[PDB]
A paper describes a structure:
Here, we demonstrate the determination of the crystal structures of T. brucei GMPR; a protein that, unlike the GMPRs of host animals, possesses a CBS domain. We further show that TbGMPR activity is regulated by purine nucleotide binding to an allosteric regulatory site formed at the cleft between the catalytic and CBS domains of the enzyme. Our kinetic and structural analyses clearly demonstrate that the CBS domain has a pivotal role in the allosteric regulation of the activity and structure of TbGMPR, facilitating the transitions among three conformations: a tetramer, and octamers with relaxed and twisted conformations. A combination of X-ray crystallography and size-exclusion chromatography small-angle X-ray scattering (SEC-SAXS) analysis clearly revealed that TbGMPR can exist as a tetramer or an octamer depending on the nucleotide species that is bound to the CBS domain.
Author numbering:
A (entry chain A), B (entry chain A), C (entry chain A), D (entry chain A): 3 to 384, 436 to 477
Write the structure that this text describes.
């Protein structure tokens, strides 16, 4: 029986509890949860919506970013479809709206309503800019839902619009948030177009965006004020074309995601994505892995972040079909030991059932957790309600776990936490 | 065994089916469902929300009226509370808003937000009129949520408001719906105050109301454009004071509602309510009753409508505690026979589980049905969702039942329907 | 199929509802529920606890009487046992206590406690009278629990008792309730012994009894102030001896109770009980029966009350084993028609599941209902709680049913009620 | 309560049993079940598969016909789709195959396999005829699956086919079943093409069809040897175009099927279908109806068969939503009384749960039953197994019911059956 006695033992979240430490924390608000998703992407909260076709599409990715997390768009769809979700997420908010929706003065109120309910943004857009033609885009005026509420379906846009000479316009393509705020206050307006030397429409700044930029300072934003979003790719020859079109559609990170990340296909994919200027301009996250040697390999291939989890859940296809997997706490412990020394953030992916588990994942070295089941069947997933409050409570649980380790930040949580193992 | 053989048999909804008749109906939209609630109150759809503390308070009464039905506010609360719900329902929409919410120019943006979220209307109000003082109410300007979105909590209302000289005002206290519509179109504004000879604020007309008055032509409205609502009273000495305060708060009908309406207390209450000018200005509905002689008595007492149903449900307190009741179809058949001859509408109250039952209730002579259980636990009741779509489907079922009797109107449904009795 | 078509149909309680009548009742308290149990026994409420070994022994019989009803002691026990329960019920309260518990001055505090917890009364007795000897019973003093609370188990009763010269005594063997009340008020005492010309103890009047006689004016009392109780006998040769010992133990009525009362054994038993002076001094109730001819026979045999019900419940031994029975409403209708004309009260026995059923039983002509299941498993039955509140709610239901028939009394309920028959 | 007492009572199948009659039947096989579907369509067994999108498409319609019944193709699909199912059913078997599948000699074995698995027939076709070109169709040879079993995907059809000079051919376009049988026996062949004066392919006769025509003499066949099938239409303007395309695709009857057949829309549709030569060449069946007057109306409109059943099932949309319907036994009794006198067959549609119910339907006057639920979830419906054995047992039950009425035929079953009504 010696061969059996020498098999090591792996621990999942349910095997351990965080041991209560000395805590100097004197206020719940002193606990900071900002963290890294990959070498070059910070997040206010360490929550990632899983790239599952039951969890993360446009609406989920928008909500996560607004909470200060991020979502990874899944790849079980056509390249065109996956880029379309991406474009919509990027369209959700901005500072300078590139290519704002326009309409022509001799179109009807019916066509205006259709323009305002554009499918390029969930919920449509708040106004249409009336310009002379699609070629030149000389700004003549503006039309909102308010301008249509008493019109007959056939009335001209020109009859109804606010003319440009009664609008507040700017030619400052570098206008600051304080500047356009002042413009909106002085002019009592809610839309400021940016036009060029000859009155041609270049951008739109909306009061709706200015308000978001002043309030939810937690949102995950790219440099243009748009919501952060990531997207997954496979490793097949065609996934490279998918990656390129995703980066061009606006992806902020790429996630190489196959069930068995400690494979030559996965490493070579990482090398490929990093070695092409069309894709090396965003961080490359790779997985899934469960061992230190795997973590070594992917890091050495160039990965900017690792996704941890092979057969993490107690009943999952990987365990029942192939018989493979690693209990997730051991896997997070083994992988982050290697990755910490290399400065590579780790996503703990799978097997998390409660906010208490998130605290253990971080305590065991992860920088973010990825959530599938806990977020499926929320409103924004493709019954549980809206995902925002679930996420906020999860972060609340984590903060509470952090205080039990006496940690005021994610690094401290990783350095300070001590586990104790249960049985029955 | 002869004494048992001579007991008559009563039928409930589940004993019968509507027999399919010859139908000339060539379109679902040819079926008209307008009906009478009482001698002087018409309704577009024959649905009444029951005066139960689990069903009908402000939100339910508002929704029913908007669907074209009505709700009866229950009396299991203080007179002040019941009038407060009434006032709020009346505040939900109007044509001329009497006593519109005001604010003073040296108040703060924080006080403006509080004014805009007034508890006198569910959802607050859409604007505040800035006037010189509460005494004189000289109109200086207007302030909306839009005007506050970039203000600091301590900024003056005067700094933020649209001044009156930039507003559209009217002195026409008799302005028509077409008139103020034109004012709103020409001026691109969404609020038109009505002021007096010296600029004192008298009324407010809002674009929000004008739009409702043009669209949902089905709503149950009093002469001022407000939503129709009724309220219940008991028969005790104090219920007369309740009735008077309810009429003065705006009730459109009073419902005398006790479990045993064929009683001297109930008749005398009806005589009392009709014999006092403070209450005889609205229709008096009375119940509950289940026999022809009872219907006779209440009509003779002066009732403008009868509410039918004593022990209507298969398992209800009345049957289990007292052992009394009448199967509801027989009760509707007996009572409406008497009432039809007298021109007195009948509410079939209780025992309705499906839209099919509503069709039988009407088929058996009722002019309206009252719904408790089917409407409890909707959003607007104090999980099923919003009540609007449930009501719309119920009316859909009724229209379908009407077509099976080949009826294009409620009268025809009552005159044409024939029943067949089931068993096992 | 003609032979089947001619079988008559019988109705149980669940086939009918009381039809709501015109009610002049202007207050719940105007409804009087007093009724007759037998020709010579009135009751404040028409509730009888069934003579079942799971329902009615001493504690149940006491509670029913205190509520204003009565219990029938069951006969499934030895004559000695059944008389013992009877004696205890009679011992529960009185005006003049015959043979009050005594003790001798040289007995110990331990023996006093044992005397005070006499098993002849549930709860023991409130005091012991200290007399000179069992033969003469010359009153020397009184001892209560209060007098023992600081005594050692071996202290003499004489050391602890209140001596007679400090007591309030009376020689008035005909003392009235107002008289002894005055004695108790002037003397601040709670026990007044009645002694004879030579100081020999004859009776005891206790403040506890005086208080009951002033408060619960609803209790069912015999002429001596004791609780009313009845007892059941069979029809075998030995049941005559049981009847005689029961009457002598204090029974106020005898109930001849066999499953098939329309039998020669039952009639002859009634003739026997009525024809013997040892038993003809209390009313003779007989049953069980379900037909008019049976009611005729027993009345003609001399019965002072009939107990109605043969196979009354839907699942009972009589129906499943023998296949016999009558639906209980028909049985009550048939039997009381005969009995009303003869002035013989009827107990509706069995098949009652709710207070609504009690109202139907009375409505169908019964003068009392007998309850088994509804009272079993109450505290006073040999989990539901105490029987008092269950009984009070049952009477409440009946009063409510009475108001639906517009009846202010039991006779009116019987004369006025009208039924309607249900189906599905 | 008089108005309730006068409502008539309707019976469903579960209210009655067939009364056993004197039976002279001396063998199960003496019971003949042939019947009429409509004035001009006979069936060997009275079973019709309901025109429900869960029951009857191509496979169901084929199986029913082979059992000797018929299926009605449902209309919840596009005209093109409904005709496509029709064409396939007609393609299932034939005597002379019109337009048999061909192939050209220089096509490949791969293209032959694709031809043999044509989607125009469930299961494909048994051979391809090799002809010179699509224009002329000069027969050069024949190719079957057997001819391909050792070929490489690129081998020429010409290399593999049996050449025409080794085939058995006929020029007899009127060849009888005995004639072509003899040809197949003498020539040991399984396919006999019919060619014209110049060797052009006109028809194909297959051994597979000859065998079916000799064995299952019960099948429902049109004059060409194809399986009988019917199709449903609505009453909207476009259903006339659907009817015309269905007749042209080969429909043997049309079924006008709306929930409320006693309507002007339905009558006018019947008049329309009968008054157009494009549709008056097949029988017009109409429904659904439940009254004698309705039966009168449709017959008078010209209907060749009535479909009986409005709200036939205990829990169906019609009863729960509209509250309408007729217990199905009464409805069959009322309608067939009228229709018998006019020679118009009746389909009892709905509410049948067991083969015993089928016997009652026939006993009550129906000529056929329509089955939905009992046939859904069989293999041939779009788990219960194959529909053939279920149908055969149903017919077995009916034959047994027929023997209990002592009937040797459907007419006798209708004339002889007597019902008895149950209760609990
Ligand atoms: N007006 C306008 N808004 C756009 C456009 N594209 C994206 N948006 C976004 O849509 C929002 C428009 O304003 P609203 O309609 O008030 O949106 P909301 O209040 O968040 O709902 C802003 O957040 C814009 O950044 C566009 O082309 N025109
Ligand atoms: N502005 C204003 N509205 C009022 C007042 N009282 C009731 N209302 C009603 O509240 C609504 C105000 O407009 P909104 O805030 O846009 O309401 P909504 O769009 O229905 O939500 C109108 O329907 C008014 O009739 C009031 O005092 N001021
Ligand atoms: N003291 C006394 N009470 C008796 C006797 N027999 C019956 N009782 C009854 O028991 C009660 C005695 O008083 P308490 O001990 O206060 O009884 P309780 O307050 O009802 O408990 C009275 O109701 C008496 O009628 C007796 O022999 N002596
Ligand atoms: N060979 C052939 N058969 C056809 C064609 N169209 C329909 N069929 C039918 O398909 C069957 C072909 O024979 P098999 O392939 O043996 O069919 P099966 O044995 O019933 O399976 C016959 O019943 C034909 O009537 C056709 O174009 N060619």
């Amino acid at each position: 029986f010696n061969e059996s006695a020498s098999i090591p033992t792996g621990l999942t979240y349910d095997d351990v509890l965080i041991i209560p430490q000395h805590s100097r924390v004197t206020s719940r608000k002193e606990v900071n949860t900002t963290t890294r998703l990959s070498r070059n992407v910070k997040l206010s909260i360490p929550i990632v919506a899983s790239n599952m076709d039951t969890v993360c599409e446009q609406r989920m990715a928008v909500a996560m970013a607004r909470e200060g997390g991020i979502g990874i768009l899944h790849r079980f769809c056509s390249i065109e479809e996956q880029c379309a979700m991406l474009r919509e997420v990027k369209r959700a908010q901005s500072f300078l709206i590139e290519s704002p929706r326009i309409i022509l003065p001799h179109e009807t109120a019916r066509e205006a309503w259709e323009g305002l309910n554009w499918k390029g943004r969930v919920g449509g857009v708040g106004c249409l800019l009336v310009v002379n033609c699609k070629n030149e885009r000389k700004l003549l005026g503006i039309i909102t839902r308010h301008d249509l509420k008493l019109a007959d379906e056939s009335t001209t846009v020109e009859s109804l619009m606010t003319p440009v000479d009664k609008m507040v316009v700017s030619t400052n393509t570098s206008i600051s948030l304080e500047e356009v705020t002042h413009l909106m206050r002085k002019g009592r307006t809610a839309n400021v177009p940016i036009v060029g030397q000859n009155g041609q429409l270049l951008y739109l700044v909306t009061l709706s965006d200015v308000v978001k930029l002043r309030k939810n300072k937690q949102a995950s934003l790219d440099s243009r004020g748009r919501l952060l979003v990531g997207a997954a790719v496979g490793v097949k020859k065609d996934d490279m074309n998918r990656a390129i079109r995703l980066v061009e559609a606006g992806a902020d990170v790429l996630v190489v995601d196959i069930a068995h990340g400690h494979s030559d296909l996965c490493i070579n994919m990482v090398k490929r994505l990093k070695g092409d200027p069309r894709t090396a301009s965003v961080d490359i996250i790779a997985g899934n892995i469960a061992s230190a040697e795997a973590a070594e390999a992917l890091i050495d291939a160039g990965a900017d972040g690792l996704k941890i989890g092979v057969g993490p859940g107690s009943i999952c296809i990987t365990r029942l079909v192939a018989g493979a997997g690693v209990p997730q706490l051991s896997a997070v412990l083994a992988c982050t030991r290697v990755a910490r020394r290399r400065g590579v953030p780790c996503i703990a992916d799978g097997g998390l059932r409660t906010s208490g588990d998130i605290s253990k994942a971080i305590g065991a070295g992860a920088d973010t957790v990825m959530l599938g089941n806990m977020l499926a069947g929320t409103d924004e997933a493709p019954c549980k309600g809206p995902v925002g409050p679930i996420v906020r409570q999860l972060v609340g649980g984590l903060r509470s776990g952090m205080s039990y380790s006496g940690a005021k930040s994610i690094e401290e949580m990783q350095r300070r936490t001590r586990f104790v193992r249960m049985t029955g």
